[PDB]
Design a protein around this motif. Sequence first.
Motif, PDB file in Angstrom:
ATOM      1  N   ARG A   1      15.709  64.117  14.188  1.00 26.26           N
ATOM      2  CA  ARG A   1      15.259  63.208  13.150  1.00 26.26           C
ATOM      3  C   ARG A   1      16.063  61.907  13.123  1.00 26.26           C
TER       4      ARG A   1
ATOM      5  N   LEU B   1      32.132  73.949   1.476  1.00 22.50           N
ATOM      6  CA  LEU B   1      30.839  73.304   1.306  1.00 22.50           C
ATOM      7  C   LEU B   1      30.848  71.801   1.589  1.00 22.50           C
TER       8      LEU B   1
ATOM      9  N   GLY C   1      26.422  61.278   5.802  1.00 21.03           N
ATOM     10  CA  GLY C   1      25.984  62.339   6.698  1.00 21.03           C
ATOM     11  C   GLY C   1      26.939  62.663   7.844  1.00 21.03           C
ATOM     12  N   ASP C   2      26.976  63.943   8.235  1.00 21.76           N
ATOM     13  CA  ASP C   2      27.884  64.395   9.277  1.00 21.76           C
ATOM     14  C   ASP C   2      27.592  63.758  10.630  1.00 21.76           C
TER      15      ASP C   2
ATOM     16  N   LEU D   1      29.983  62.458   3.950  1.00 20.75           N
ATOM     17  CA  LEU D   1      29.369  62.898   2.713  1.00 20.75           C
ATOM     18  C   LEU D   1      28.040  63.576   3.006  1.00 20.75           C
ATOM     19  N   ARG D   2      27.861  64.779   2.454  1.00 20.52           N
ATOM     20  CA  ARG D   2      26.647  65.541   2.670  1.00 20.52           C
ATOM     21  C   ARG D   2      25.590  65.184   1.624  1.00 20.52           C
ATOM     22  N   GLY D   3      24.782  64.184   1.994  1.00 17.60           N
ATOM     23  CA  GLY D   3      23.650  63.767   1.195  1.00 17.60           C
ATOM     24  C   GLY D   3      24.110  63.212  -0.146  1.00 17.60           C
TER      25      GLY D   3
ATOM     26  N   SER E   1      11.951  67.861   7.581  1.00 17.41           N
ATOM     27  CA  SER E   1      12.018  68.773   6.460  1.00 17.41           C
ATOM     28  C   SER E   1      11.075  68.358   5.328  1.00 17.41           C
TER      29      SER E   1
HETATM   30  N1  TE9 Z   1      25.174  68.266   6.040  1.00 20.19           N
HETATM   31  C1  TE9 Z   1      24.145  67.741   5.382  1.00 20.19           C
HETATM   32  N2  TE9 Z   1      23.139  68.529   4.941  1.00 20.19           N
HETATM   33  C2  TE9 Z   1      22.124  68.017   4.209  1.00 20.19           C
HETATM   34  N3  TE9 Z   1      21.099  68.954   3.790  1.00 20.19           N
HETATM   35  C3  TE9 Z   1      19.813  68.718   4.310  1.00 20.19           C
HETATM   36  C4  TE9 Z   1      18.775  69.617   4.053  1.00 20.19           C
HETATM   37  C5  TE9 Z   1      17.420  69.237   4.588  1.00 20.19           C
HETATM   38  O1  TE9 Z   1      17.319  68.158   5.258  1.00 20.19           O
HETATM   39  O2  TE9 Z   1      16.464  70.000   4.272  1.00 20.19           O
HETATM   40  C6  TE9 Z   1      18.996  70.818   3.301  1.00 20.19           C
HETATM   41  O3  TE9 Z   1      18.075  71.630   3.048  1.00 20.19           O
HETATM   42  C7  TE9 Z   1      20.355  71.047   2.816  1.00 20.19           C
HETATM   43  C8  TE9 Z   1      20.657  72.213   2.085  1.00 20.19           C
HETATM   44  C9  TE9 Z   1      21.929  72.434   1.656  1.00 20.19           C
HETATM   45  F1  TE9 Z   1      22.250  73.555   0.980  1.00 20.19           F
HETATM   46  C10 TE9 Z   1      22.912  71.502   1.855  1.00 20.19           C
HETATM   47  N4  TE9 Z   1      24.244  71.752   1.447  1.00 20.19           N
HETATM   48  C11 TE9 Z   1      25.446  70.898   1.413  1.00 20.19           C
HETATM   49  C12 TE9 Z   1      26.190  72.168   1.865  1.00 20.19           C
HETATM   50  O4  TE9 Z   1      27.495  72.130   1.370  1.00 20.19           O
HETATM   51  C13 TE9 Z   1      25.033  72.957   1.152  1.00 20.19           C
HETATM   52  C14 TE9 Z   1      22.635  70.394   2.581  1.00 20.19           C
HETATM   53 CL1  TE9 Z   1      23.904  69.241   2.770  1.00 20.19          CL
HETATM   54  C15 TE9 Z   1      21.370  70.125   3.066  1.00 20.19           C
HETATM   55  C16 TE9 Z   1      22.054  66.658   3.972  1.00 20.19           C
HETATM   56  F2  TE9 Z   1      21.009  66.164   3.279  1.00 20.19           F
HETATM   57  C17 TE9 Z   1      23.046  65.809   4.421  1.00 20.19           C
HETATM   58  C18 TE9 Z   1      24.101  66.349   5.129  1.00 20.19           C
HETATM   59  F3  TE9 Z   1      25.109  65.585   5.594  1.00 20.19           F
END
Ligand code: TE9
Lengths: 723, 723
Positions: free
Chosen positions: A355, B2, B24-25, B45-47, B317
Amino acid sequence: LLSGKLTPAQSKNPAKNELYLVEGDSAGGSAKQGRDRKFQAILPLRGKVINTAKAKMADILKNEEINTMIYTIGAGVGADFSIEDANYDKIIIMTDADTDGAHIQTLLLTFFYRYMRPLVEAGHVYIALPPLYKMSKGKGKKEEVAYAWTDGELEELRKQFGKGATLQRYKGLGEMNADQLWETTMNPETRTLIRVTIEDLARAERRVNVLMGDKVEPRRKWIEDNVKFTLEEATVFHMSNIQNMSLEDIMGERFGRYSKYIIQDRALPDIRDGLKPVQRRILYSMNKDSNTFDKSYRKSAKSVGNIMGNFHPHGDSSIYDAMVRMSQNWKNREILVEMHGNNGSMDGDPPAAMRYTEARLSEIAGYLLQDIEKKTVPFAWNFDDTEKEPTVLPAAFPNLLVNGSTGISAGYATDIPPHNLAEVIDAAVYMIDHPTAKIDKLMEFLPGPDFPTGAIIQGRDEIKKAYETGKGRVVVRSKTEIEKLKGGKEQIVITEIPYEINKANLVKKIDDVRVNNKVAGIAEVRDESDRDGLRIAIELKKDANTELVLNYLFKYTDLQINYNFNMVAIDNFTPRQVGIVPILSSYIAHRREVILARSRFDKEKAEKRLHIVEGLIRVISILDEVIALIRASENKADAKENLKVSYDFTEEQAEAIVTLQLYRLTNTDVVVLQEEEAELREKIAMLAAIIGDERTMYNLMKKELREVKKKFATPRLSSLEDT
Amino acid sequence: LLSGKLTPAQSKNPAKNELYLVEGDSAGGSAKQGRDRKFQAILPLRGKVINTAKAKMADILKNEEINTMIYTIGAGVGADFSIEDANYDKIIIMTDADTDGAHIQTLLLTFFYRYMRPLVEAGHVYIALPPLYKMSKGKGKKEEVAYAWTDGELEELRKQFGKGATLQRYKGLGEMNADQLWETTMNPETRTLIRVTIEDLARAERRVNVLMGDKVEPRRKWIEDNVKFTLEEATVFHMSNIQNMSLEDIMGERFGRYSKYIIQDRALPDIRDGLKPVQRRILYSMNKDSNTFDKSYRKSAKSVGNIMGNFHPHGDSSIYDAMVRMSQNWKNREILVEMHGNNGSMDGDPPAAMRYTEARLSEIAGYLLQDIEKKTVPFAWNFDDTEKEPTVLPAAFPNLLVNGSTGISAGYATDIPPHNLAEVIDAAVYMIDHPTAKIDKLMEFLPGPDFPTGAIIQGRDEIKKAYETGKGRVVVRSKTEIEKLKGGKEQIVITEIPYEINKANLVKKIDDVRVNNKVAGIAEVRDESDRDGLRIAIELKKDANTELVLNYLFKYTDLQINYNFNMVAIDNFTPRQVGIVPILSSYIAHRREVILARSRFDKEKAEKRLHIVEGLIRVISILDEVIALIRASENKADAKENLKVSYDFTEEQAEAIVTLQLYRLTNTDVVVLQEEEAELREKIAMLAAIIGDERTMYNLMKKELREVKKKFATPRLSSLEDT
DNA sequence: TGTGGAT
DNA sequence: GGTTATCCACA
DNA sequence: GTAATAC
DNA sequence: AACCGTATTAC
Ligand SMILES: Nc1nc(-n2cc(C(=O)O)c(=O)c3cc(F)c(N4CC(O)C4)c(Cl)c32)c(F)cc1F
Ligand SMILES: Nc1nc(-n2cc(C(=O)O)c(=O)c3cc(F)c(N4CC(O)C4)c(Cl)c32)c(F)cc1F
Ligand SMILES: [Cl-]
Ligand SMILES: [Cl-]
Ligand SMILES: [K+]
Ligand SMILES: [K+]
Ligand SMILES: [K+]
Ligand SMILES: [K+]
Ligand SMILES: [K+]
Ligand SMILES: [K+]
Ligand SMILES: [K+]
Ligand SMILES: [K+]
Ligand SMILES: [Mg+2]
Ligand SMILES: [Mg+2]
Ligand SMILES: [Mg+2]
Ligand SMILES: [Mg+2]
């Protein structure tokens, strides 16, 4: 929870209850929706199940998959196994009707054989058989549909209802609604099972061991002796209702199917273009959609989806990963894909998902596909017969050696290292002129591997061995240098490391040496590499023996390694261990076929055209008569007939004339046509010569190879030493 | 656990070190590869990061994301915070230059404002600013490295070589190699930052609270007052080097951008076709690729990839989930997508991933797209200007009410329930004939929602309220019945449940009542549903008050719920709370535009053709003269000129004549042409009349709507009571 | 608590 | 392939 | 203990 | 988006 979760039956009834073991959680879903919950339980299996013959006993009972399966049956295992404590009367294994499905069945049966034997001999293990085909009549709400497992049943349906019906070829369980799945595969009244039985304990034992045990050579031997790589199979005309089969026959039929497939069509490269099917499909599909080096990058997800939709019936995960690898220049000597974004690094950190990234074919990948449009290479139908795909690419450079290949099949594996393009071509050109050339001579042009990571290769005698037999072991050693420091201190600086070695782990492993003080005198380890160069720095303490340290590190870390050649590839449908001579000779033979085919194609075009031009030249001298003639005709057909009868034009010429647009009558220049006639006659002569004379053809082959080398040649990266 | 993991700088140096906070990672990867590790650290940062204004401190420091960010800075938080204990001199926030990027920046700044204020006012937080444009890697042989942030800079770059070489529009950080990223945004010497400052503590406080606090109405008000929904924006002439900006101005500019986007182009449907952009794109793209109900299904991953590649710049997604929803008939009254495989269930178990499923548009979805090929609807350029996409669909049925829509924006939300198509159309038809029709009358044709899940809707007075104001609260109650049993015992049998309710959790929640014995007299709960019907059975004990139980279950489980109408949609680019009358009137106005546009298109075709035919009829009478004329011309251009000058043909006619094939000169049959001419004149008259008379047009509108109702009409499912 | 397009 | 987070509004 | 296509 | 398992071969 590493294992799938059990969805139980509403009741307890060992007499009737059934446990469905389903390939994957998603199909486990459908199964759960489609079942009759009164007596049908569902346990999904997460992909490939542990080989209970190869692995230990410890480990086998650390496998959550297995333990939850033992638990669920409720009769323990092996030593204490009690059949009267079972919770189900039937254990039904339900997988895709594809090769990987066959493999899972195999793996499970060798569990039940080895650890739940009384269950198998009591006739309580079964294989559910999903349908292979679905026929559809009309459209909208007037659809109508039936199903078929064999080709014979399918032929019977073509009558039943035809006259414009169409056919779906199921590639797995994932393409079925839960009600489709109930009606065909889960309903006692309409399903078709096979009941697994043990006819001969001895023959079954032996059969399981040869196919599943840790000894490779018996299994390879078995494959060589049983699977016909050269041929097709014919499906088991299934009997509606139950059908018995021996464990022996099942294991053989199933493992045979899987072995063959992952040998021919997954893990091993074709000896000519040096590609695996996935890789070939990536390139073909990307090329077909004009995703080429001269045009814009294109979202990776788009490329992947089209590949998966049109050619490669497997996970996106696999496709994308393969495509990513083809873009990493520390893995491929000549990358076949350019990819914007995070496509990983030598530190082995995970690439961005499809993506995020975007991609296109590299310029040189163009040359793998060159002249594909000209019927130069055999095409096959894809899985749903919508579209043809190439079984091999034209391959205007000898990619197998240039980029190499590593893989792991069944009974066989491969490790071919990359080589310098120019060297490889020099070798091929020599061989064109000298078919019987031997290794020593070839090695004057192609002295050894050239890794994209560079470094030092040692072992001339083993390189030669590898080039003769396909196997050999060589030594790859990091490129180092010493830098003096303030304080009367030195530091070791690594600038190139060995192929296939993860830099970040290397650095860590080196620092473990320091931490554990395995060798004295290391001050600090620092990865100083950046986007402009690789640079690891090992700062030594004040007066510590620089050479003692460096030697210890080469010996006891991957700062130096052994690379093992195991050159295996697919030649005439069968796997084959091969040196340089088979490789290069196969390539040459292939380019011969391509060029001949190319030249036949181009000559037919020029012929057809020249025939038209000959006619147009005549027309001009009688232009007015021809117009009057057409005007005096009744219709298109009549006019052509009169052109033939009156002026002896051919059908092909008559068609051309009569379909000319009126405005053409303005331009009536004969000499421009005569110049075209001339150049066509010349072109046909050149092409005829190639078709007609092996020497002429091979000289062309050599000419083109030099053009390629001239264009793409790069300096060697790995240095060669002898000892 | 997390949170993203920190990749530290080689050294400790608070004077110089910089912490990059990356969206994002994956981009965290690129950043880590591209950086100068001596002094630059990276924390991904995760989202979306927690809103530190809305959530209250406690839950804020159970947020791993925040804790690892506090820890990393090494200066605690809140009133403890000591600036001299910081590990970096600069905290740089680096996100995509898109709306969701803006949103992240927003969320982070309100963290640092609220919990690390001295850091912000010491001028130590920054924004990173990646480039928006690049002047082509596919620009000859590259050697171009040319980037631009504004449109003005981009215009300056157009004066570079290759007089028309190409442009990349960056949609995010994921399309950049680590070296591109270093050179443009991470290198002190060449990057462009924004330094965040606090010019006025009071104004900043107020600004943060209104945009980020739990009170919606101030925020809505702010949006209404500040966001220009009908306008374009223009970027800052950014300054090379640092540029200072107030927290106030940043928060406003950023949140403004995000709000607008997720209002107009994400969460809220268009009032005419009742679609969100993602949904419109799914249908348009699928339709364009002939993935329609009459043709075979097509792998979901393929569809999705093309959507993502051509139209929708967001994760697969999101796209796939949206596409899946459009296929679930317990969520949509009229499904717009048919999907083979596991597409979920009422039990809410997860659908198969796009690699498993396949899909096509439903028959009725055809009618949303009807006459799209006929320039009936406004098109815009897609994100990379390769391709045009529709801003609304033609919508031959009023999908907004029929399928409804639920969404959550910023400052606004929507909940429109589904309706019965036939009822809706009856309403629309009445309104066509009676523009001023009032709710009471309309409700004779459209009495209330019709959920695909059925059940009982109670509250006529609130339905009417909702249809007037856009808001109302109604009661949805499961369809039940009693069955007598053997031991003088009863059981409650549910056959339909409320819209948007997960069956399996309902069943669980009910059984918890039994287990906890909250109310006396439940014997057993059993989900007896299957692929043929919904059936939950609650077996009661001997002499337990079955009405006491049933009432308790309605009250304290979702066996009965309140549905809240909040009918909000996009009308002329701005969000709008609306009843039935605006909805229906908007639809009618839209269909008017479509039909007029359709008829203008069809008439232009017939006109152009008739004009050709009139000319061809003439030619025949002067055929010899026309041939002589062409023969006496010099070329195509000259011939046409002579046809115009000498025989007063138009350019359009002259082109047609001159491009005729020679064999046409046989034909001298004027009659067949005259019959065509006649039909064309008739056709134009009908079409002109539609354009020229509102009544004629509206009768057509009504005719078509009835055809649709006749074809697709379905019995009502939800029964209506008044409470 | 949980709806559905987003990261 | 499941597991795990956040945003946003509204009962 | 590791490579790369697969589930 | 990371984290987690397996098959297959050959050191
Ligand atoms: N590492 C990163 N992940 C996500 N991210 C994307 C998801 C998707 O595109 O459908 C998703 O379903 C999703 C669920 C999660 F539970 C989740 N979590 C953060 C974790 O600690 C639990 C994250 Cl992060 C999630 C992001 F959008 C961006 C990111 F860098
Ligand atoms: N549930 C199922 N998952 C997988 N599967 C697929 C992966 C892929 O498509 O790349 C993958 O990377 C993967 C990693 C895993 F760690 C993994 N594990 C099983 C868990 O316990 C750990 C599994 Cl299973 C994985 C499967 F191929 C089939 C499945 F049903
Ligand atoms: Cl047997
Ligand atoms: Cl301020
Ligand atoms: K038992
Ligand atoms: K890259
Ligand atoms: K070593
Ligand atoms: K022509
Ligand atoms: K389905
Ligand atoms: K309730
Ligand atoms: K014509
Ligand atoms: K005629
Ligand atoms: Mg499969
Ligand atoms: Mg994986
Ligand atoms: Mg983005
Ligand atoms: Mg997700």
